């Protein structure tokens, strides 16, 4: 169908643009589709994009409006008073301002379907709310109206949510098109998604990206696919991962890393209402905080993320209690059998089950997947799905038995209520990944497991040492490996806060020269630094110059290869914000070779200070671009919970930072 009214080209400068008598008497029948593009890189803090009213006394609650707010968020009010109903259905971060310092064309298409009872709001290809209404209210069909506006809304004669902005195109249809038609209207789109809601993972849902540039030239990513909503464990999650052969243009179908199947992976839309929001999957086995490195001696690619069995998250996690016990300088995995107050078994060598209170081998082992065998014959458990049907969330039995694993809440056989680190690896640059070993503990029997720092880890250019870094309160505690992996040494760092979400990503500003940059409590990025690839690190330091709230948000950093003004130069991402986890930056610095100090003398804003940026993840890409994938909202924001398709990817260029 063609449109009844196309228009384009009008300027938002504080002061509405009537098209009433282009509009109005074409609008007929109860279905309509907006279709506008439209640039808005200095917004007021509440405006309108477009407007239908009843401009009358008495009639200022008739109308429907398409309104954003300078957070991002995009919404629209349908509202008519004779027949009692106010409508407003919105969505936090769901536009672009800025891109490469030049306003972004943003694509919305609103859907009003009658028949489906539905209305439908497309932002930049992604769909940013759905909602079907019992008593459906057809837009034009609202009492008395009487204006059609661009740039406002007229309520009882004044201009209301005047907007600053343009609106290069807008059309009208009098149908509701499908969602087949509204995926062929083209997009001016600053950004690509790797990872998305419908993808492979079937996560609605994904938080905490990475990216690493291997050797040959291909871009790897991982990331949390987050099924119960973007809560942090406990829930589902689990880790995918997605790679470019071709300098980021395209990427993989994801496949997992590291998956738990005793739940479903369901693609759910997770309530964001204030009585259900907090609706957390509370039986699943989940992994959290993904990081990659690229070993050089094997070749192989390695993953670590932490672990968090049936139920489990930081919060509820066992501070006192590693879930090992030690045996002359050996640490077993301890598990608790169905029916039995204590832990009186273990996981020995081959993965025999150990009877403590005996000191006798079973009939039971755990193979390398951890599931549970009784004389080399595989037990299963049934899976769980989840569902609100009842208005509630509900974790229920499905039929599907899937093998027993010692992380599931249904085993035979549990392991300790704790947080753990698990690794596992790839022979084919991330096309399959290996089953995930756990990492021993490193802060003795009586002390839960750090928390794994998501990013990268370090692989040191000059030998074949590998560095991840893990916290923990006190403390960042870095994890070496100088055999690809196989076993592996702490080296623990003091820090002057307790109770820190001390995230940290390292550089290697020269050969055994590393620089971890981390966040604090403090409200400033902090760094330390070590001389001898890691053995030891120096007192805390603070950058001046980048602001972040006082709770903090991770920072990925990286030693770009080429000069910079004629100096070594190091890349930070991080929100730039004392106030929110908005304002993203890049911000380039130059090293002093004198004493290794930092000159934060470039900062690149990603999009508007008040757009949401949150996580991230930078890599320099084998052409020697940039390459970003981000979220792209407040992850912190109690008001922004539940987004997707806010996770997303961007290539810069040095020139368009400096
Ligand atoms: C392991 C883990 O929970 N990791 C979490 C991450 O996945 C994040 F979501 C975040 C966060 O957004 O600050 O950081 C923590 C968490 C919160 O601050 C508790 O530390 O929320």
């Known amino acids: 169908i063609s449109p009844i009214f196309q228009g384009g080209s009008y300027?938002?400068?504080?002061?509405?643009?009537?098209?009433?008598?282009?509009?109005?008497?074409?609008?007929?029948g109860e279905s309509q589709t907006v279709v506008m593009k439209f640039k808005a890189d200095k917004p007021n803090s509440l405006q309108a994009l477009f407007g239908?009213?009843?401009?009358?006394?008495?009639?200022?609650?008739?109308?429907?409006?398409?309104?954003?707010?300078?957070?991002?968020?995009?919404?629209?009010?349908?509202?008519?008073?004779?027949?009692?109903?106010?409508?407003?259905?919105?969505?936090?971060?769901?536009?672009?301002?800025?891109?490469?310092?030049?306003?972004?064309?943003?694509?919305?298409?609103?859907?009003?379907?009658?028949?489906?009872?539905?209305?439908?709001?497309?932002?930049?290809?992604?769909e940013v709310f759905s909602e079907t209404v019992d008593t459906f209210l057809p837009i034009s069909n609202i009492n008395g109206i009487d204006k059609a506006t661009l740039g406002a809304v007229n309520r009882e004669g004044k201009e209301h949510y005047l907007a600053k902005g343009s609106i290069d195109e807008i059309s009208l249809f009098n149908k509701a098109i499908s969602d087949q038609e509204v995926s062929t209207i083209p997009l001016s789109n600053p950004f690509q998604l790797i990872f998305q809601s419908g993808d492979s993972t079937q996560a609605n849902y994904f938080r905490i990206p990475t990216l690493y540039t291997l050797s040959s030239g291909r871009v790897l990513s991982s990331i949390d696919a987050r099924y119960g909503g973007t809560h942090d464990s406990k829930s589902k999650i689990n880790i995918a991962t997605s790679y470019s052969d071709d300098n980021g243009k395209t990427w993989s179908e994801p496949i997992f890393a590291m998956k738990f199947n005793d739940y479903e992976e369901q693609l759910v839309y997770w309530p964001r209402d204030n009585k259900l929001k907090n609706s957390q999957i509370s039986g699943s086995a989940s992994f959290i905080d993904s990081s990659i490195v690229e070993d050089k001696k094997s070749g192989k690619t390695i993953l670590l993320a932490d672990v968090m069995p049936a139920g489990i998250g930081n919060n509820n996690a066992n501070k006192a209690d590693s879930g090992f016990k030690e045996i002359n300088g050996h640490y077993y995995l301890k598990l608790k059998k169905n029916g039995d107050n204590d832990?009186?078994?273990?996981?020995?060598?081959?993965?025999?089950?150990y009877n403590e209170t005996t000191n006798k081998p079973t009939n039971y082992t755990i193979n390398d997947k951890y599931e549970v065998l009784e004389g080399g014959k595989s037990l299963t458990v049934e899976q769980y799905s989840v569902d609100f049907d009842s208005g509630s969330l509900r974790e229920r039995h499905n039929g599907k038995q899937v093998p027993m694993n010692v992380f599931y809440k249904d085993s035979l056989f549990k392991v300790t209520p704790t947080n753990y680190i698990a690794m596992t690896t790839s022979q084919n640059?991330?096309?399959?990944?290996?089953?995930?070993?756990?990492?021993?503990?490193?802060?003795?029997?009586?002390?839960?497991?750090?928390?794994?720092?998501?990013?990268?880890?370090?692989?040191?250019?000059?030998?074949?040492?590998?560095?991840?870094?893990?916290?923990?309160?006190?403390?960042?505690?870095?994890?070496?490996?100088?055999?690809?992996?196989?076993?592996?040494?702490?080296?623990?760092?003091?820090?002057?806060?307790?109770?820190?979400?001390?995230?940290?990503?390292?550089?290697?500003?020269?050969?055994?020269?590393?620089?971890?940059?981390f966040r604090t409590t403090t409200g400033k990025i902090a760094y330390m630094t070590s001389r001898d690839s890691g053995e030891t690190w120096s007192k805390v330091s603070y950058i001046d110059g980048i602001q972040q709230t006082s709770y903090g948000t991770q920072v990925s950093a990286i030693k770009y290869s080429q000069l910079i003004d004629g100096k070594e130069a190091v890349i930070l991402s991080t929100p730039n914000s004392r106030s929110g986890r908005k304002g993203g930056q890049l911000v380039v610095g130059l090293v002093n070779k004198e004493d290794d100090s930092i000159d934060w003398k470039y900062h690149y804003g990603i999009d508007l200070p008040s757009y949401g940026y949150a996580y991230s993840a930078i890599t320099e890409l084998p052409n020697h671009h940039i390459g970003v994938l981000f979220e792209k909202y407040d992850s912190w924001s109690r008001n922004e919970l539940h987004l997707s398709n806010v996770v997303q990817y961007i290539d810069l260029e040095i020139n368009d930072l400096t």
């Open 429 to 517: 640059r991330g096309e399959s990944w290996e089953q995930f070993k756990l990492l021993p503990p490193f802060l003795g029997e009586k002390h839960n497991g750090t928390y794994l720092c998501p990013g990268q880890g370090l692989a040191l250019k000059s030998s074949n040492r590998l560095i991840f870094a893990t916290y923990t309160s006190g403390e960042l505690t870095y994890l070496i490996s100088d055999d690809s992996g196989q076993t592996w040494k702490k080296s623990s760092a003091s820090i002057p806060f307790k109770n820190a979400t001390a995230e940290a990503q390292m550089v290697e500003l020269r050969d055994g020269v590393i620089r971890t940059f």
């Open 11 to 28: 300027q938002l400068n504080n002061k509405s643009i009537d098209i009433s008598s282009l509009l109005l008497d074409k609008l007929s």
């Open 343 to 353: 832990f009186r078994y273990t996981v020995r060598e081959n993965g025999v089950v």
């Open 52 to 126: 239908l009213s009843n401009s009358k006394a008495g009639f200022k609650n008739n109308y429907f409006s398409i309104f954003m707010r300078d957070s991002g968020e995009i919404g629209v009010e349908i509202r008519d008073a004779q027949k009692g109903i106010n409508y407003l259905f919105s969505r936090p971060a769901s536009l672009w301002g800025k891109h490469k310092g030049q306003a972004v064309e943003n694509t919305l298409v609103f859907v009003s379907d009658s028949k489906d009872k539905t209305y439908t709001m497309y932002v930049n290809g992604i």
